[PDB]
């Protein structure tokens, strides 16, 4: 039902866009030259290209549960290697957000079940290493926001230790940014962690 | 530079949206109820929410190199488990597309280097098992398109063998769809593989 | 802590004995390694490659996981394979399945094993689905588990044979790949007839 | 194929010998397993857990990878841990690092090792970066490799101690976790003083 609506809406968007610019799709099929790799949360409220007000073809993206960057995870590392070594993107944006379900999960003391407890483990590690600080926050939603920000900082550290990324910094001046999307106001701010 | 422009454009989009609907962001921060899990390629030309002409909050998404669904990959499986067992999405859309870089990579005979040769291995396996058919296509771009379609079919098979997914089919009537986004015309079509 | 401390004690005893037998055994061990076999097997306590092959420390390079599963995108296994084939230049890759495999039995049952295990065993569950007719027709439970474990070895061999490092090393060095089966009841290892030749 | 066929031959000889020593050894082995130790170690050919601990097939459940690295999201290792702790109810988890570790040395060099290996070794490279002062001050290369391998054991222990299954099993069953180091030169295993107690 909603799937068939999504198909209808795709055809509508494509038709309107094809009238707007008869050369838009033919140039799009020609290739891509995105300048940003976006790594974010799978959350439905975080479509990178919409919330940044940009166009198809300029944001190369990876999205997972709680925007977690893990050192040995091959899924994410493939996206990073292709983006940095092949597409030569100039910016890497690791984005956390408010009301993150994975963050909230890591703050909980229960088994979420299945694969998720293992996937969220580096966030739980972030929980344990800042437990003093997180527990001191009386407001639950601000606690979820805080652990999401700390998760961004950690993910940035991992990114700054990625060899493909550091080669690109050293030779091309690749930039890395940790940002936070606040859904309540719809704004994205810098957390102050990254290349400079 | 383009990063700072992306921030400006985010603030602009947020401002305009906040005038359009003063309750949009406050309800967004309230929670999510997406009805679709979208699994697609990291390609910058494939932002799911734009090409489907939808809004932030209704498409839960995972994106990787060449939209590959691997049986033991925990990154993807976390997104699937959270989407199906916790968000209770009603549709899963595995989307391949034309001019896929990973597909083209799998069609090549060279080492792409780093982690990518290992990540694309299930696509290379698709290459080998349909080598007769793929080699018979004289046009390179149509060969890339074909292997991308076959990759979608394979990923669907894996999805249909995921336990979390099949439980949801058996008890909730979860639907699974394999689709293909043709960048040249901007349209998404069904490949005819999935639940029904 | 008792059994662990016993393990340390037995280590010290084994080291004392090995060192009296050959005073140059350990210094030569510490010099480097030149194993000729990469062993990929099940984590099963009953399957220690170096003991059952009656060989010595320094000649078998090994990776072991649940139900000896070789997955295409698994970075853990691929690292061991890459290091073994491209750095140590091993001449043989042995994928060894075995009888009474718990992971195999888990794949044959229809209940949730829980945690991460259903996902790890998913490619074995996939082998289950594609041979359901053959597997279900087997009246003996132990022979059904043995059979699904052997089919698992065959599948893993196919994956290894599609690995780029392995495939190149076959093409230029004559790297060999073998699918074998360790039958615990008789303690013997047989070839399954799948691999390089 | 010679060395592989020799391995099959030696297996048959070992099985013949083990079967004459104890005619009930193999049938009892085939009945099931009750290992009390989960061993996590390096794939290194010089580190076969069951030999160096001087124990028998059926009492050590093992996972082995490059440089014995325990990564939080690695599903391969987590499967072995889950099966060992929640199904077999092992009482001890032994993370064993060793001397002359190739992965350790790889992490200490600054060149690309190539393929998947830089990514797998990334958490060891991370340990390198955080202890660069200590590691660089070591004049002896072999003691630098040993040191980074020990720090790697310590880090892996921290990860194991944050694992939910391990943590629960500690809380209710008194599961124990030990960080150890196998020094190949003398063939002895020592405790690093990191773990449950
Ligand atoms: Cl053959
Ligand atoms: Cl202690
Ligand atoms: Zn989130
Ligand atoms: Zn693509
Ligand atoms: Zn087994
Ligand atoms: Zn080692």
Cβ contact A45:B56 at 8 Å: yes
- Cα separation values, D125 from A6, B69, D131, Å: 45, 29, 10
What angle is formed at CA B88 by the lines to CA A149 and CA C119, rounded to 5 degrees? 80
**Strands of C37-42's sheet, edge to edge?**
C188-195, C176-183, C92-98, C37-42, C60-65, D60-65, D37-42, D92-98, D176-183, D188-195
Instruction: Return the number of other C-beta atoms located less than 10 Å from residue C164's C-beta.
Output: 18
- Cα separation values, B55 from A3, A44, B165, Å: 14, 9, 25
D83 close contact with C: CB closer than 8 A: yes
CB contact under 8 A, D163 and A72: no
Cβ contact D93:D40 at 8 Å: yes
**Among candidates B28, D110, C159, which has minimal Cα distance to A50?**
B28
| CA dihedral sign of residues B161, B167, B171, B172 | negative
Residue of B62, B97, B143, B146 marked catalytic: B97
Minimum-distance CB partner of C122 among B118, B122, B161: B161
Nearest residue in chain D measured CA to CA from B78: D73
B119 close contact with C: CB closer than 8 A: yes
Q: Domain residue spans in chain D? A: 1-197
| CA dihedral sign of residues A151, A72, C46, D160 | negative
Nearest residue in chain C measured CA to CA from B162: C122
Minimum-distance CB partner of A114 among B17, B52, B81: B81
What's D134-186 look like in SS3?
HHHHCCCHHHHHHHHHHHHHHHHHHHHHHCHHHHHHHHHHCCEEEEEEEECCC
CA dihedral C26, C31, C36, C42 (to 10 degrees): 60
Partners of B194 in the β-ladder: B177
Count how many Cα atoms sit within 13 Å of the Cα of residue A26 in the half-sphere of its side chain.
5
Q: Which two tokens stand for residue D155?
A: 């880090």
**Range D149-152, long-range pairs (CB < 8 A, 24+ positions):** D149/D67, D149/D97, D149/D98, D149/D99, D149/D101, D149/D104, D149/D181, D150/D97, D150/D181, D150/D192, D151/D127, D152/D67, D152/D68, D152/D69, D152/D97, D152/D101, D152/D104, D152/D124, D152/D127
Q: Is residue B41 marked as binding?
A: yes
Would you call B194 helix, strand, or coil by DSSP? strand
CA dihedral D45, D165, D78, D89 (to 10 degrees): 50
Q: Is residue B58 marked as binding?
A: no
Residue of D63, D96, D98, D144 marked catalytic: D98
Would you call C60 helix, strand, or coil by DSSP? strand
**Among candidates A153, C33, B11, which has minimal Cα distance to D43?**
C33
Residue indicated by tokens 């149509």: B142
Cβ neighbors of B141 (< 8 A, separation 6 or more) are: B98, B99
A100 vs chain D: nearest CA distance in angstroms? 19
Distance CA D143, CA D141 (A): 5
**Among candidates A90, A86, A87, A95, which has minimal Cα distance to A38?**
A95
How many whole angstroms from C197 Cα to the centroid of ligand 1?
Answer: 4
**Among candidates C70, C176, C172, C166, which has minimal Cα distance to C127?**
C70
C165 close contact with D: CB closer than 8 A: yes
Residues 126-145 of A with CB under 8 A from B: none
Is domain C1-197 classified as CATH 3.40.50.10710? Answer: no
* Domain B1-196 fold: Beta-carbonic Anhydrase; Chain A (3.40.1050)
Would you call A70 helix, strand, or coil by DSSP? coil
Minimum-distance CB partner of D120 among A72, A117, A161: A72
* Residue D59 annotated to the active site: no
Would you call B39 helix, strand, or coil by DSSP? strand
Partners of A37 in the β-ladder: A60, A92
Experimental method: X-ray
* Residue B45 annotated to the active site: yes
Q: Is residue D42 marked as binding?
A: yes
- D touches which chains (3+ CB pairs under 8 A)? A, B, C
- Cα separation values, C169 from B53, B125, C25, C81, C87, Å: 49, 18, 31, 11, 11
Helices (H), C22-175: 25-29, 49-52, 75-86, 102-108, 117-120, 122-130, 132-137, 141-162, 164-173
């Amino acid at each position: 039902n909603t799937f068939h609506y999504a198909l209808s809406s795709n055809n509508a968007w494509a038709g309107y866009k094809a009238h707007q610019n008869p050369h838009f799709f033919p140039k799009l099929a020609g290739g891509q030259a995105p300048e940003i790799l976006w790594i974010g949360c799978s959350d439905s409220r975080c479509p990178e290209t919409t919330i940044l007000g940009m166009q198809p073809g300029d944001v190369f993206v990876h999205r997972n549960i709680a925007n977690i960057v893990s050192p040995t995870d091959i899924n994410t590392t493939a996206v990073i290697e292709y983006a940095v070594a092949h597409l030569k993107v100039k910016h890497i944006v690791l984005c956390g957000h408010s009301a993150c379900g994975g963050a909230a999960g890591a703050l909980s003391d229960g088994r979420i079940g299945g694969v998720l407890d293992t996937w969220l483990l580096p966030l739980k590690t972030v929980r344990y290493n800042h437990a003093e600080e997180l527990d001191a926050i009386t407001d639950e939603k601000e606690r979820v926001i805080r652990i999401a920000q700390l998760n961004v900082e950690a993910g940035i550290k991992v990114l700054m230790n990625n060899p493909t990324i550091r080669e690109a910094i050293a030779e091309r001046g690749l930039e890395v940014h940790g940002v936070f999307f606040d859904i309540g106001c719809g704004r994205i701010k810098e957390l102050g962690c990254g290349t400079a």
